[PDB]
Amino acid sequence: PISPIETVPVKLKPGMDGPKVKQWPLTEEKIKALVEICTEMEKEGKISKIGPENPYNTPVFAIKTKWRKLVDFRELNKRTQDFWEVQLGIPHPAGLKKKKSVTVLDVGDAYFSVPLDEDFRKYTAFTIPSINNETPGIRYQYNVLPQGWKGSPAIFQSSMTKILEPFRKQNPDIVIYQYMDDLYVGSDLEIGQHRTKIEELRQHLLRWGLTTPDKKHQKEPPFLWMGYELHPDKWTVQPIVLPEKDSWTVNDIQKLVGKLNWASQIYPGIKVRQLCKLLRGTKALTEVIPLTEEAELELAENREILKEPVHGVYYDPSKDLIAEIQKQGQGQWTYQIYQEPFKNLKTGKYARMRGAHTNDVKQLTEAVQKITTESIVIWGKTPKFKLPIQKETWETWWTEYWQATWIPEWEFVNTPPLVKLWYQLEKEPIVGAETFYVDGAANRETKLGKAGYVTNRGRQKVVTLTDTTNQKTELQAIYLALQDSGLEVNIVTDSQYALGIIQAQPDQSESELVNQIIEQLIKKEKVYLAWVPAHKGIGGNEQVDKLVSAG
Amino acid sequence: IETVPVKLKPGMDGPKVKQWPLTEEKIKALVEICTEMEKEGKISKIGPENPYNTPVFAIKSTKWRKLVDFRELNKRTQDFWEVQLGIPHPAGLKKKKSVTVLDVGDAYFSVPLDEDFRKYTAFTIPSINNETPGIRYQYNVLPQGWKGSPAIFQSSMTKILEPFRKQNPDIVIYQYMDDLYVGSDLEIGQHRTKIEELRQHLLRWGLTWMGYELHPDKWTVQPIVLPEKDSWTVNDIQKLVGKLNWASQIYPGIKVRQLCKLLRGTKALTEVIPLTEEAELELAENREILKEPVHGVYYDPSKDLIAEIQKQGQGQWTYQIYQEPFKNLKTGKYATNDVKQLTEAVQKITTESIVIWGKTPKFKLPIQKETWETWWTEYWQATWIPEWEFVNTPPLVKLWYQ
Numbered sequence: 001p002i003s004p005i006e007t008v009p010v011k012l013k014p015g016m017d018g019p020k021v022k023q024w025p026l027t028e029e030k031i032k033a034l035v036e037i038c039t040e041m042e043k044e045g046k047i048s049k050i051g052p053e054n055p056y057n058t059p060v061f062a063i064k065t066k067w068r069k070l071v072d073f074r075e076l077n078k079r080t081q082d083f084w085e086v087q088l089g090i091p092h093p094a095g096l097k098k099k100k101s102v103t104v105l106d107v108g109d110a111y112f113s114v115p116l117d118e119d120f121r122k123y124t125a126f127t128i129p130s131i132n133n134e135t136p137g138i139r140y141q142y143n144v145l146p147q148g149w150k151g152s153p154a155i156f157q158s159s160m161t162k163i164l165e166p167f168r169k170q171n172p173d174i175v176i177y178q179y180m181d182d183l184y185v186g187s188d189l190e191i192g193q194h195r196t197k198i199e200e201l202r203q204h205l206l207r208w209g210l211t212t213p214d215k216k217h218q219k220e221p222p223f224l225w226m227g228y229e230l231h232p233d234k235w236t237v238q239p240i241v242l243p244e245k246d247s248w249t250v251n252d253i254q255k256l257v258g259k260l261n262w263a264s265q266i267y268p269g270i271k272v273r274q275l276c277k278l279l280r281g282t283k284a285l286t287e288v289i290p291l292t293e294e295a296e297l298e299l300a301e302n303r304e305i306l307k308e309p310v311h312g313v314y315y316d317p318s319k320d321l322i323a324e325i326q327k328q329g330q331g332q333w334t335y336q337i338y339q340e341p342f343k344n345l346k347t348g349k350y351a352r353m354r355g356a357h358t359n360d361v362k363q364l365t366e367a368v369q370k371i372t373t374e375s376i377v378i379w380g381k382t383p384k385f386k387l388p389i390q391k392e393t394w395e396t397w398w399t400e401y402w403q404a405t406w407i408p409e410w411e412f413v414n415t416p417p418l419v420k421l422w423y424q425l426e427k428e429p430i431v432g433a434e435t436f437y438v439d440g441a442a443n444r445e446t447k448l449g450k451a452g453y454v455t456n457r458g459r460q461k462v463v464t465l466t467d468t469t470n471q472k473t474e475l476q477a478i479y480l481a482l483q484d485s486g487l488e489v490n491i492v493t494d495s496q497y498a499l500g501i502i503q504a505q506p507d508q509s510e511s512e513l514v515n516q517i518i519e520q521l522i523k524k525e526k527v528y529l530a531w532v533p534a535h536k537g538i539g540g541n542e543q544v545d546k547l548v549s550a551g
Numbered sequence: 552i553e554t555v556p557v558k559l560k561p562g563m564d565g566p567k568v569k570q571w572p573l574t575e576e577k578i579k580a581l582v583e584i585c586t587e588m589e590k591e592g593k594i595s596k597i598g599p600e601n602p603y604n605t606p607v608f609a610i611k612s613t614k615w616r617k618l619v620d621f622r623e624l625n626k627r628t629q630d631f632w633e634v635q636l637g638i639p640h641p642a643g644l645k646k647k648k649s650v651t652v653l654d655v656g657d658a659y660f661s662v663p664l665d666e667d668f669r670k671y672t673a674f675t676i677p678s679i680n681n682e683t684p685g686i687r688y689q690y691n692v693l694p695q696g697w698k699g700s701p702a703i704f705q706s707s708m709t710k711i712l713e714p715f716r717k718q719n720p721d722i723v724i725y726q727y728m729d730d731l732y733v734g735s736d737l738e739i740g741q742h743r744t745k746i747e748e749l750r751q752h753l754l755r756w757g758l759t760w761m762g763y764e765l766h767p768d769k770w771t772v773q774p775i776v777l778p779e780k781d782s783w784t785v786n787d788i789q790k791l792v793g794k795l796n797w798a799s800q801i802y803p804g805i806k807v808r809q810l811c812k813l814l815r816g817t818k819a820l821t822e823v824i825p826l827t828e829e830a831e832l833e834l835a836e837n838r839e840i841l842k843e844p845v846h847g848v849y850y851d852p853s854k855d856l857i858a859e860i861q862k863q864g865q866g867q868w869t870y871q872i873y874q875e876p877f878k879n880l881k882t883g884k885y886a887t888n889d890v891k892q893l894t895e896a897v898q899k900i901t902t903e904s905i906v907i908w909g910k911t912p913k914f915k916l917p918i919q920k921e922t923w924e925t926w927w928t929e930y931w932q933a934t935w936i937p938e939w940e941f942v943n944t945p946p947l948v949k950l951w952y953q
């Protein structure tokens with residue numbers, strides 16, 4: 001059928017005329033196949049023969065023992081208006097409410113069962129050429145949504161929405177998920193009440209030009225859908241096999257990481273860090289990469305996690321979501337969401353770096369934010385968090401940090417490793433502590449550098465660096481002062497950059513230097529750090545600047 | 552009442568902005584509201600042949616309210632509402648004893664929108680777990696939050712306020728977006744009596760972090776403040792020289808020569824050090840300068856205002872407004888969680904900016920983008936939304952503003 005639903009009015013882009021692309025002469029077999037395909041479509045209303053006046057054209061091709069007609073709408077697609085996006089996202093199984101009964105209906109010949117705007121049809125002209133293009137071709141235009149045309153997915157979707165609208169109003173507690181050509185229908189009715197409700201949906205649909213499978217042809221649970229398996233009271237990902245290989249190519253590791261990432265939605269504790277490090281990053285597709293011992297270790301832990309099947313549960317909207325997070329080594333976080341303790345709706349991981357330098361409190365906060373968003377998307381509400389950080393540690397951090405930082409309702413859970421701050425900077429100068437005035441200067445052309453200090457105890461020192469930056473020497477200067485220092489020390493720098501880094505209490509860095517500084521800061525008992533304006537002739541700063549600039 | 556033709560520039564296309572995820576209770580609030588508006592003819596369902604989108608939110612009392620974020624449409628339509636139909640901003644409003652803000656956005660819903668412009672007002676109510684495609688609508692009438700609405704309605708607003716202005720020639724009334732700003736020098740009881748009077752006028756045409764009234768004649772600069780100390784350590788003078796070095800960039804006449812002389816060469820930070828007569832004069836003459844506004848900085852109407860905010864701890868926030876960096880037009884401060892406090896400060900600073908300049912600043916916000924974007928509508932009460940971006944506060948600038 002072709003739906004009686006009214007059409008969507010459709011334009012070309014403001015300054016553009018329709019396509020006039022020249023039909024290449026075609027093999028005899030292809031011409032014959034097309035004539036046969038088009039004759040049958042013509043008799044169903046899909047296409048219509050058109051006059052000679054129509055100036056537009058789009059190339060047709062035929063490929064194979066059935067022949068298929070391919071229309072190349074590349075040019076028309078460039079010329080047709082933009083449409084609104086089909087979807088903001090895709091359903092997640094963890095967001096599904098368990099139903100007593102659920103049916104899958106796929107619409108048959110979806111696009112060809114929906115009419116095209118009459119004012120737009122002319123732009124869809126194509127020509128079956130005559131043998132050796134000696135005589136005028138047979139000319140057609142579409143009356144329905146063509147396959148491969150930019151507007152077809154959106155216009156179809158909105159046709160189904162309109163059509164479904166009345167049926168939803170009369171049956172407000174039947175769940176209908178729309179996804180491409182598919183309709184997924186769920187109720188809490190007894191088998192027979194549902195079967196009957198489905199029949200009147202099917203009939204309502206058939207009245208609007210849309211055919212659907214019979215009860216004899218309908219799929220049975222479990223549904224294999226979009227890489228998931230959807231059972232009556234659980235869901236999981238479709239089976240994952242991790243290849244065993246002597247030699248791993250770049251291609252093989254990428255596919256592995258993709259699979260692991262997919263599995264991470266329900267299998268807890270999946271890790272991918274050491275395998276991703278192998279992919280940085282110059283290497284050919286079929287080039288073999290030897291597995292480091294760390295990648296090997298990580299692969300083996302993943303295999304244990306995947307050895308036995310794990311399932312997820314469905315959503316019950318009359319209970320809170322609870323989200324728990326664990327630190328799984330450095331940079332890596334893992335989480336689980338459940339409503340009843342340890343029946344997970346879903347699982348996931350977070351293992352990112354916002355910035356070159358960070359700490360665990362900042363990473364945990366970021367992980368909470370990611371999870372919070374994900375939850376709003378899947379369930380329309382925020383979970384309650386259970387976090388491996390003491391309330392006191394968190395209070396101490398957020399009250400003193402310069403960013404606004406907030407996390408919604410949470411409780412401490414003693415699941416080590418616990419998140420903590422590994423050092424703390426003094427709020428005041430330390431009495432009876434040596435003050436180091438530090439400085440760094442690097443020549444812009446030679447990229448040579450000098451890092452040093454002068455102190456109130458009379459000490460002095462300067463070291464020499466090669467291919468540094470001014471940034472690097474200011475850090476190098478601070479590391480010197482920490483190295484040559486007692487357990488208590490005051491440090492005066494004129495680098496805002498270094499002060500910024502250290503004040504945020506990093507415990508992790510992309511920088512080797514910064515990680516060396518962090519080692520030292522942890523060992524110290526007290527550190528006070530102060531900043532002064534450079535070149536303003538401030539005692540101490542003036543002096544280190546001297547020995548440091550010499551070069 | 553027939554429509555004013557609206558235009559974009561020849562070569563700007565309408566907004567195509569993503570809808571942020573919404574919670575179930577707000578989604579439900581929005582479909583109650585939008586079901587009503589459609590019944591009333593204010594909006595209509597649209598089809599996929601409209602490629603535009605503007606984000607929508609639900610805000611608050613206990614009454615839910617629709618807030619459409621027309622920030623992109625406003626930018627893309629600035630020639631219309633600013634140069635073609637601009638509402639002149641009065642310089643006297645900031646001089647008044649009391650300014651009251653009244654919501655008048657209900658006025659627009661009675662005035663039909665140019666049918667060729669309607670498509671650019673498209674918005675989407677999203678669905679939980681992407682169950683349904685979710686509900687697309689466009690406006691048939693002047694929408695709230697679009698700056699073209701007051702622009703178009705000012706002719707009718709002028710009729711409405713005409714007797715009241717005539718009868719009260721020393722009260723200033725300014726329309727910014729969906730609100731009227733009403734200033735007088737009257738005593739506060741008489742002021743509130745005149746507000747009630749104005750409400751009655753508006754009522755005959757179908758109508759209606761801050762406090763009850765604003766009090767802008769009492770608005771001040773937060774002076775960069777130098778401590779007075781019993782005793783000065785080296786650290787202390789360093790901190791002082793830092794503050795003064797940075798203030799010397801803003802204020803003509805700042806000096807530090809004398810104070811730097813104190814810091815000889817490689818002392819302990821804790822070491823107390825005597826305060827000289829020249830150092831003390833310089834210090835005292837700096838204080839006088841910092842009491843006054845910045846000499847040389849003026850509002851340029853052809854430039855964007857920017858606002859910077861620092862988290863100062865203990866529920867305290869500081870802020871600066873300027874057009875050229877660190878050339879402050881205004882500075883101030885605001886005082887249960889960080890995001891809530893921050894949103895309150897943004898709304899306070901925006902309101903001040905509307906009253907003083909007739910425009911909003913672009914904010915530099917010391918917060919993670921995703922956190923702000925998750926949480927802000929949870930506390931937002933205004934009917935406009937300023938432009939913002941997300942920033943790391945330099946740790947020193949916080950120090951210099953207290």
Ligand SMILES: N#Cc1cc(Cl)cc(Oc2c(Br)ccc(Cc3n[nH]c4nnccc34)c2F)c1
Nearest residue numbers: 091096098099102184185186221223225231232
């Ligand atoms: N294929 C498929 C498919 C995909 C989706 Cl996203 C949903 C779907 O239908 C369901 C609906 Br509608 C609503 C709930 C569930 C989960 C479920 N509840 N009871 C079931 N019995 N059998 C299978 C799945 C379910 C569904 F699978 C089927």
